[PDB]
């Protein structure tokens, strides 16, 4: 048959892609196995084009080659994608034409009996852009479209294209008559992860070199938003760790390799590598939190508990709702009140598989277009999960506000406003948290209509509160504490926590005698009221 | 345990151990058990830092100690041309030797 005499799905080694393979078979391969007599009675024409789109980290290339060998293909020709380019005029068109020479020769010599020819293009988006002068990129598309369904007729070819961005391809190439079927390859679920792990651990299990302590269901459970490449890297890293464990005890001292031959990768190796070696692209990253929450979260008053409870309620509502897939909340307060830290903590306590934060810090000196590109890229990436959480910090800074004028970048404002009211594709959830310090001006720009609710973070306003905060901080002694309490209780204070820490550090540099006096003097100086 | 002393690079000694631990464990252990493990080697490493801090010397020492062939040095700004893209030509000459070596000697 046109297919190889021997082939089975299980041998291909591809794990997770089950419905996609079935649909591709049913569409693009039905007519090529059904006996020729009934087919010529059909008079139908085989499909001669297929497109695949997936996110980076799915190795569809594996699927490409695996499908190619699944059939009795001859020698799938391949082009990287930037090749077939030359400086001299009228060269790329000739190179493109050279590809089909064998197919046309066979079509002329034989007929209804020539073998199949397969061409594998990589990253079609590279060259086949929209045809507007587009330089050489316009003369190549015309020749390609000239070849496919040309004045003449080919019936022994098949073309496979792979691209990550399907919305930047020339529409003229996308017709009911060429490259018709398109399929999406996405991230796998638990079962696919388990199957991939089985595939990549079969060999190790074969030679009794995998410790009996390791469990694969636990690994599949823990690894979330992971891809095949990431999982294979994980297995390789575990092997390398188990290996290095033996490079310091047996071969290091050139002692009996019996202990070196007792090599067995154990759960410890995996649980040491899973935390310090692999950084998923679409998964949590536990370094931003420690970078933002620099001094923990000490409880100095009730409002913290209220804020945390409200955030928890918001999180539960997002998770458990059906008719409200999008939700927003805005945190506001006076400067130096601890907004960013609280937002980071509430985000961390959500346990969602995807989380991300964006700060002005990672865009210094950029231009408005670049900022817009970054924001859209982040949101696009987030769109691809079943659960996600994003944090946009210091909104006023993104717009570049300045009271004089006023002046700001309207473009970024429009982009943000529009984004705040776009639902993701069907069946996926989202949650947006914003931080600001100038709620009024935010109101005049009409942007508060977009937000769903707001929370208020107050400051410290009582001597009892200040004394409790000092006690909880662990500084100064009983007599100093008493002198401060007997001094400050009379009046009222108004200060943010962060400035309080700054001031304590300021005061802790003088001699033991004058510390309290300097602290009190400065505290009084940096005082004000609403 | 390797050795890095009196052969030029002298300032960096812990770095060799760190990098070797992280990278070069597959190529030091007898190949038989390795093919039994059915694993692939790393395909590149990055170095970065302030200029003039002895990075090239480190690369040359690593190349010498692995018994690999002569390194093929190249610079960034040199590979750039105004002929509607002739960079791909510049890029492709570099991997010929590996291509032919693989074609002839196989694995």
């Amino acid at each position: 048959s046109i297919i190889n005499p021997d082939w089975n799905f299980e041998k291909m080694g591809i794990g997770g892609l089950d419905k996609e393979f079935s649909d591709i078979f049913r569409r693009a391969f039905a007519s090529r196995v059904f006996p020729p007599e009934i087919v010529e009675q059909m008079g139908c024409k085989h499909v001669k084009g297929i497109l695949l789109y997936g996110p980076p980290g799915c190795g569809k290339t594996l699927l490409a080659r695996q499908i190619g060998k699944m059939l009795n293909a001859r020698e799938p020709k391949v082009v990287n994608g930037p090749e077939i380019l030359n400086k001299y005029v009228g060269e790329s068109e000739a190179n493109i034409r050279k590809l089909f020479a064998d197919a046309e020769e066979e079509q002329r010599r034989l007929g209804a009996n020539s073998g199949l020819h397969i061409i594998i293009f990589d990253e079609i988006d590279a060259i086949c852009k929209q045809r507007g002068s587009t330089g050489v990129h316009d003369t190549v598309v015309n020749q390609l479209l000239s070849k496919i369904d040309g004045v003449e007729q080919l019936n022994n070819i098949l073309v496979i294209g792979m691209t990550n961005r399907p919305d930047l391809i020339d529409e003229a190439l996308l017709r009911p008559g060429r490259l018709e079927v398109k399929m999406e390859i996405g991230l796998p679920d638990e079962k696919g992860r388990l199957q991939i792990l089985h595939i990549h651990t079969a060999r190790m299990r074969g030679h009794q070199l995998l410790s009996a302590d390791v469990d694969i269901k636990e690994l599949a459970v823990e690894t979330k938003n992971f891809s095949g490449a990431e999982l294979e890297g994980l297995v390789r890293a575990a092997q390398s760790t188990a290996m290095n464990r033996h490079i310091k005890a047996s071969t290091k001292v050139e002692v009996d390799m019996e202990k070196a031959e007792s090599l067995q990768v154990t759960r410890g190796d995996f649980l040491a590598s899973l935390e310090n070696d692999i950084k998923p692209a679409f998964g949590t990253n536990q370094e931003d939190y420690a970078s933002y929450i620099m001094n923990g979260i000490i409880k100095w008053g009730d409002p913290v508990t209220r804020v945390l409870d409200d955030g928890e309620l918001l999180v539960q509502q997002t998770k458990n709702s059906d008719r409200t897939p999008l939700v927003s909340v805005l945190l506001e307060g006076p400067p130096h009140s601890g907004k960013t830290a609280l937002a980071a903590k509430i985000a961390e306590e959500s346990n969602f598989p995807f989380i991300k934060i964006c700060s002005p810090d990672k865009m210094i000196g950029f231009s408005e277009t670049a900022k817009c590109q970054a924001m859209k890229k982040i949101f696009d990436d987030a769109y691809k999960s079943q659960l996600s959480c994003v944090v946009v910090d210091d909104i006023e800074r993104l717009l570049d506000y300045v009271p004089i004028g006023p002046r700001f970048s309207n473009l970024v404002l429009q982009a943000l406003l529009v984004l705040l009211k776009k639902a993701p594709p069907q069946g996926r959830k989202l949650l947006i948290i914003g931080t600001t310090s100038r709620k009024d001006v935010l109101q005049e720009m009409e942007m508060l209509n977009a937000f769903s609710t707001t929370i208020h973070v107050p400051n410290i306003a009582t001597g009892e509160q200040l004394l409790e905060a000092l006690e909880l901080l662990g500084n100064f002694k009983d007599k100093e504490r008493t002198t401060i309490a007997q001094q400050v209780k009379g009046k009222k204070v108004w200060i943010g926590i962060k400035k309080l820490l700054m001031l304590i550090e300021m005061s802790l540099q003088m001699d033991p005698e004058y510390r309290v006096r300097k602290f009190l003097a400065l505290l009084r100086e940096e005082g004000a009221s609403p | 345990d390797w050795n890095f002393e009196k052969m030029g690079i002298g300032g960096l000694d812990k770095e060799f151990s760190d990098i070797f631990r992280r990278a070069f464990a597959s190529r030091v252990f007898p190949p038989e058990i390795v093919e039994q493990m059915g694993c692939k080697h790393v395909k590149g490493i990055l170095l970065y830092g302030p200029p003039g801090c002895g990075k090239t010397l480190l690369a040359r020492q690593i190349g010498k100690m692995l018994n690999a062939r002569e390194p093929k040095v190249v610079n960034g700004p040199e590979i750039l041309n105004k002929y509607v893209g002739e960079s791909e030509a510049n890029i492709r000459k570099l991997f010929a030797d590996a291509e032919e070596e693989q074609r002839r000697l196989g694995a």
């Binding site: 400086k87 001299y88 005029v89 002068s133 330089g135 050489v136 | 002929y83 509607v84």
Partner: peptide, 28 residues
């Protein structure tokens, strides 16, 4: 995108055909 090409010739006066006829005749 740009560029055009060119070509050139050279002094060759091969006439290997005639020299081959001649030398073959010489052999016989």
């Amino acid at each position: 995108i740009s560029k055009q090409a060119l070509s050139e010739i050279e002094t060759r006066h091969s006439e290997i055909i005639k020299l081959e006829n001649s030398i073959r005749e010489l052999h016989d």
